[PDB]
Structure 1
Amino acid sequence: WVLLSTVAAVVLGITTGVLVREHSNLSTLEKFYFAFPGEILMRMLKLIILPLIISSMITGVAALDSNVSGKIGLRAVVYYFCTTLIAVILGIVLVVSIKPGVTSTVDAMLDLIRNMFPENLVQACFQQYKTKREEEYKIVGMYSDGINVLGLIVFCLVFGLVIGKMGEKGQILVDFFNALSDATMKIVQIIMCYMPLGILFLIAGKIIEVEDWEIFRKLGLYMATVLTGLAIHSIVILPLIYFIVVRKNPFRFAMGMAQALLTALMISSSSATLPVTFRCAEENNQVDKRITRFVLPVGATINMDGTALYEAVAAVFIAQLNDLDLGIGQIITISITATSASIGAAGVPQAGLVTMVIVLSAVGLPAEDVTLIIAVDWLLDRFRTMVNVLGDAFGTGIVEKLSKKELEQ
């Protein structure tokens, strides 16, 4: 129902936008009031960011076992790091080169580490740290507004690891944040019931307020940038990584995952596609069962190739829309924030939307600019999930080749 409701809201929002745009002259004040239901939806999404990322980040980390630290688990983590790193570079290169929404670096990277360790946990919920050179030059910090997602994610990772390893002493903390994570999921579900009506006025409000259709061509280039990045990752990069490690034709392996790929094109969830991925990887591709049960669940949470090519590209596209010429330091900040946002909004309905709201809030871009992403979020998220499933499927074969000796004992 979520897909049809979101699609209908976009269709109805466009229909409402063009009818109100022509059949009625609206002043600047009335246009702002017309988008109030959409504005209220954005407030709910920002409201749930803080409890969602904190509880989800603690809950996922606190349940980690010793298998992740094993040789099989370490190889999977290294593989997902390398493919995500390639996807991060590929997404940055494409959005910088194509420049879809268009017409110091040391301090930006140092600010990334500074925000990675906030000076106050409560302030990190609504403030971020920035440094600017002053005049022979000195550095001055400001602590501007904006939720510090990187600081919260880092602390919740360390906090989750600590409470996971202290056994029954920290079991109450694991239980507390498990229930809090479940409660936040239900509240997100309640918000998604209002999302279609909010999307209708967000889309219609955006159609009314625009004066020229040049932004639509910019949206078309944004689709090309996201689709081009996924196409290169799925057809060029991932098959090449598979072949060099396994020395076997990756297209027969991809053909074996055909049923899992189609299931990804409808369910649009890597976790929900796991049962199909497990069967296709195990019997069709003859990948060992002992390794699929480890690599695939690991990829269901830390496979950020799709996020790098979809959410980070979208965030940079929004930055280019606001006439912001961000540099290498700022672009890297967006990409790292996007992956941190994704791990925070993992098992969430409309994760693509929720992740985008987290990234825009944590970067400074207007979260109301996400309406252009929403109009195609249903389409682009389906392909993003398909690439993530293909990436996880290739990982099982890649990890298996490197684990031949371990599987022999």
Structure 2
Amino acid sequence: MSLYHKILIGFVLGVIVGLIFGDKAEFIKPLGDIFLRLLKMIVVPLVFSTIVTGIASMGDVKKLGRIGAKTLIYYMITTTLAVTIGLILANIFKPGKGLSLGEIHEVAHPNAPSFTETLLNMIPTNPFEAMAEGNMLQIIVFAIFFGIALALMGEKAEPVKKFFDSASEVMFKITDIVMKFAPYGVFALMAWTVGKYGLDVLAPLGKLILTVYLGCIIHILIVYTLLLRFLCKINPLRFFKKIKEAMLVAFSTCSSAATLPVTMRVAEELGVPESIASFTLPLGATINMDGTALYQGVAAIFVAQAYGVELTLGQQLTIVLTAVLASIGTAGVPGAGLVMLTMVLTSVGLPLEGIALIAGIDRILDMARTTVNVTGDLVATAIVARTEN
């Protein structure tokens, strides 16, 4: 029985156990927290080693520059589309209508940290400090510099190239060992999640959850489907059938970085060159704002409607933006997007209670956000590979 089927069995059994035992499933959470700890334990060394090896194996920096430019353009386009879809749905469906958490009042212009500060902080002043702090973007930037240096160096870098290639292989092996525990970790995660988030407690926020899930589904089935159909020119159904395991793991785990090994292994099954994937997927594991864009766009409008502050198109745009902007790097960190949105909305002046309302169901939305993020990462990989082959 394939690992995917074991993970699916664990997923469905965990869902059933959570439905039956309800809150009593909390005792099984540690078995899932162990799985999350093991997965997160690999992201940093794996990302660094794989990025350096991938850039070294290409041997030319012009190709890397082309790939980076195309990936950045694709992510900007998909983030814009995700923001558009989120705003459209939050307006068509009004999850915040009727909550009446507070009285209606005018709102001031949002304030967020300067864009230059976010750009400058992407450059580590100490690579080992970035590695220790788990700063994924700084690690990625240092890895890009290191890989470019290795690709240009040639013979003198042979020991470094070989060591980092072997290190990447070892991290992939570690992932292989860890995933033998994947069915039980997914079982525990799903049991805990379903037990905690009963349908009774989700009733007051049913509209918000439905809107977020519908937006994610629309994004996957339209933005990614059309891109695959036309730009990359492959059958979308077969593509999704190929990446079922990655989507399932991302949904269960709620963290793109933890799912990164799964996406990279699945990419091989799609036939994309290893060198291209090694650069695109780890970078997209931090820069992909699709799911975060949808979540934040929906949540800001939900909070505004809960307090009755109808927002003009300009206010809506400048609120979802500067928020996806301030969360550009921290989005990989769990709960960082929620904190950034909280700060932006507090700057807008909305009370904290509305934002704290979403925090209760953050995991339910996180599932969809992570699924969208990994699907977009794989789609970006495929599209970039197509325009190179």
- Partner of 2:322, secondary structure, is helix
Quote the offset at 1:397 in angstroms. 0.8
- Residue 149 of structure 1 is matched in structure 2 by 112
- Residue 298 of structure 1 is matched in structure 2 by 283
Quote the offset at 1:177 in angstroms. 7.2
Q: 1:68 & 1:377 partners in 2: Cα distance?
A: 39
1:395–1:256: structure 2 CA closer, same or farther, 3 Å change rule? same
CA contact (8 A) 1:352 1:381 kept: no
* Paired residues for 1:1-400 under 5 Å: 70-103=65-98, 130=109, 148-151=111-114, 154-160=115-121, 164=123, 173-174=125-126, 178=130, 219-282=205-268, 284-400=269-385
Q: Which has the higher contact order (CA 8 A, sep 6+)?
A: 2
Structure 2 unaligned regions, length at least 5: 1-17, 24-50, 56-60, 99-106, 136-199
CA contact (8 A) 2:232 2:386 kept: yes
- Partner of 2:256, secondary structure, is coil
288-297 or 66-75, larger mean C-alpha shift: 66-75
Quote the offset at 1:359 in angstroms. 3.2
Q: 2:264 & 2:128 partners in 1: Cα distance?
A: 32
Choose 1 or 2 for highest CA Rg.
1
1:303 alignment partner AA: N
1:175–1:271: structure 2 CA closer, same or farther, 3 Å change rule? closer
Quote the offset at 1:331 in angstroms. 0.4
- C-alpha RMSD of the superposition: 3.4
Quote the offset at 1:374 in angstroms. 2.1
Give me the TM-score of the superposition, normalised by structure 2.
0.60
Q: 1:182 & 1:402 partners in 2: Cα distance?
A: 32
Q: 1:305 & 1:364 partners in 2: Cα distance?
A: 26
Q: Identical aligned pairs, as a percentage?
A: 40
Quote the offset at 1:344 in angstroms. 4.6
Q: Deviations over 1:116-174 (max 9, x none)?
A: xxxxxxxxxxxx985xxxxxxxxxxxxxxx7x3242xx12134347xx4xxxxxx7x44
Quote the offset at 1:248 in angstroms. 1.3
Q: 1:400 & 1:178 partners in 2: Cα distance?
A: 30
Aligned length: 265
1:384–1:180: structure 2 CA closer, same or farther, 3 Å change rule? same
Q: 2:315 & 2:239 partners in 1: Cα distance?
A: 38
1:158–1:346: structure 2 CA closer, same or farther, 3 Å change rule? closer
Q: 1:176 & 1:281 partners in 2: Cα distance?
A: 29
CA contact (8 A) 1:242 1:250 kept: yes
- Partner of 1:81, secondary structure, is helix
Quote the offset at 1:178 in angstroms. 3.7
CA contact (8 A) 1:268 1:382 kept: yes
1:159–1:345: structure 2 CA closer, same or farther, 3 Å change rule? closer
1:100–1:292: structure 2 CA closer, same or farther, 3 Å change rule? same
CA contact (8 A) 1:91 1:309 kept: yes
Structure 1 unaligned regions, length at least 5: 1-6, 13-62, 104-127, 131-145, 165-170, 184-212, 405-409
1:264 alignment partner AA: A
1:296–1:363: structure 2 CA closer, same or farther, 3 Å change rule? farther
Q: 1:301 & 1:260 partners in 2: Cα distance?
A: 16
1:180–1:329: structure 2 CA closer, same or farther, 3 Å change rule? farther
332-341 or 382-391, larger mean C-alpha shift: 332-341
- Residue 401 of structure 1 is matched in structure 2 by 386
2:343 alignment partner AA: I
1:174–1:92: structure 2 CA closer, same or farther, 3 Å change rule? same
